[PDB]
Amino acid sequence: MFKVTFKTPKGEKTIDVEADKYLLDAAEEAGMDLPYSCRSGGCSTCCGKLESGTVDQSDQNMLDEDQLKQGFVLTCVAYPTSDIVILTDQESKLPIGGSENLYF
Ligand code: FES
């Protein structure tokens, strides 16, 4: 199965994840209470960030192309597609942005 290293605030561990199991679910089953809210791809609570490897997160409904290229992942709807190293609890890192903060 793929091996996924989850790097959390409280430590790291590496676990098996099947191709048809979402990251969040695997992590929870291995004792890691990762953040989540909606569990359906429509918020940023579960965001993680890929150090290495790939996911299938086609049901994600938050992230733009930039953000995807930066390795952001909605862990509640992400299947592994390779061995992975992922940082959890990364929502701070996602810029708020908006139409009133245009950075000049
Ligand atoms: S918990 Fe809302 S997108 Fe994952």
Numbering used by the authors: 1 to 104
Paper's wording?
Ferredoxins (FDXs) are small, ubiquitous proteins that typically contain iron-sulfur clusters and mediate electron shuttling among multiple metabolic pathways. The green alga Chlamydomonas reinhardtii (Chlamydomonas throughout) contains six genes that encode for chloroplast-localized ferredoxins. These proteins have been categorized into three separate groups, according to the plant nomenclature: FDX1 and FDX5 belong to the photosynthetic category (or leaf type), FDX2 belong to the non-photosynthetic group (or root type), and FDX3, FDX4, and FDX6 are divergent, being more closely related to bacterial FDXs. CrFDX2 amino acid sequence is highly homologous to that of CrFDX1 (67 % identity for the mature proteins), and it contains conserved residues that are known to be important for interactions with CrFDX1 enzyme targets.
Here we report the first 3D structure of a Chlamydomonas ferredoxin, CrFDX2, at atomic resolution of 1.18 Å. The structure of CrFDX2 was refined to a resolution of 1.18 Å with R and Rfree of 0.109 and 0.147, respectively. There is only one molecule in the asymmetric unit in complex with the [2Fe2S] cluster, and it shows a typical ferredoxin fold with a β-sheet formed by five β-strands covered by a single α-helix. The [2Fe2S] cluster of CrFDX2 is coordinated by four cysteine residues: Cys38, Cys 43, Cys 46, and Cys 76 (the numbering differs from that in Fig. 3 by 1, due to the lack of M at the start of each recombinant protein sequence). The CrFDX2 folding motif is similar to that of previously published plant-type FDX structures from other organism, one of which represents a FDX1 type from Chlorella fusca, with high sequence homology to the noncrystallized CrFDX1. Furthermore, CrFDX2 shares a practically identical protein backbone with the leaf-type CfFDX1 indicating that both FDX types would be expected to share the same binding interface with CrHYDA1/CrFNR1. Using this information, we visually identified residues in the vicinity of the iron-sulfur cluster that were conserved between CrFDX1 and CfFDX1 but not in CrFDX2. We specifically focused on two amino acids located near the electron acceptor site of FDX1, namely F62 and Y95:. Finally, although our CrFDX2 crystal structure shows that both residues are located near the FDX [2Fe2S] cluster and could therefore influence the catalytic activity of FDX when in complex with FNR/HYDA, it seems that this is in fact organism dependent. We show that mutations that replace these residues with those found in CrFDX1 lower CrFDX2′s midpoint redox potential to values closer to that of CrFDX1, indicating that these residues contribute to functional differences between CrFDX1 and CrFDX2.
